[PDB]
Amino acid sequence: DELLKKGDIFTQKFFATNQGKEFLKRLFSLTESEFYRGFLLGNENFWKFLRKVTAMKEQSESIFEYLNESIKENFMWVLGLLDEISSMGAVKKSIELSLKSIQLTSHLLEDNNDLRKNEIFAIIQALAHQCINPCKQISEFAVVTLEQTLINKIEIPTNEMESVEELIEGGLLPLLNQKILISSILTIISNVYLHYLKLGKTSNETFLKILSIFNKFVSDIEKKLQQLILDKKSIEKGN
């Protein structure tokens, strides 16, 4: 009733002051007592209000997952919150803030073994979608971060994930579906195809989707063609 709705009383101008800082400290610290944890974590409207990330000094630097404080369902709302925090940087001070947010999304892969196809693909789609931000500094060290997640934070053989096939044609293709973004977002895929063949974990024709998507666009992509083809036999000669 009072907090979310009434915009005239509670504006950006109000809770930048010390009163607002103490208010947000007490409200976010309310998710520590065992009595109130379940209601606040499970509520939808609380998380909708907690997407109050606008202007700067909105308790914007403070409003992390408390402060990189993970547990130690409902992950889509916090994922969107991290998404908005990371996308806030568009310029002078919040670039490192955004990088810390990207690393927080990287850390999110590890914590809870409760993992499903939709949740994981939401994470990868968010990381790849962060390349769209026009700043180069955020974009390059976002894509290397998503490489780090794809390599060092995923194992294919599970009940909840089959192999790299749907991993390629899942959430990545929304990014592929922007013209100048191809040469990075394909090249990262060219890593992940071959790295898992350090073991040999891909059938002979399972990788054809990458051979399908690359020519699906149509001249750098044509000039990038033979470079993509030639390592297929370097795999044969090694790794």
Take residue 80 and report the two structure tokens written for it: 């969107």
CA distance 5 to 13: 16
Please report where in the chains the tokens 């927080």 appear, as a residue. 104
The answer to whether the CB of 129 falls within 8 A of the CB of 91 is: no
Backbone angles phi and psi of 190, in degrees to 5: -65, -25
> In DSSP terms, which residues pair with 158 in a beta bridge?
161
Resolution stated for this PDB structure, in Å: 3.9
Residue 70's H or E segment, with its range, is none
Please report where in the chains the tokens 């949740």 appear, as a residue. 119
H helices of the chain, in order, are 18-29, 37-42, 44-49, 75-88, 94-107, 117-129, 136-152, 164-168, 172-176, 182-195, 208-214, 220-223, 225-237
Instruction: Give the angle subtended at the CA of 158 by the CAs of 154 and 160, to the nearest 5°.
Output: 90
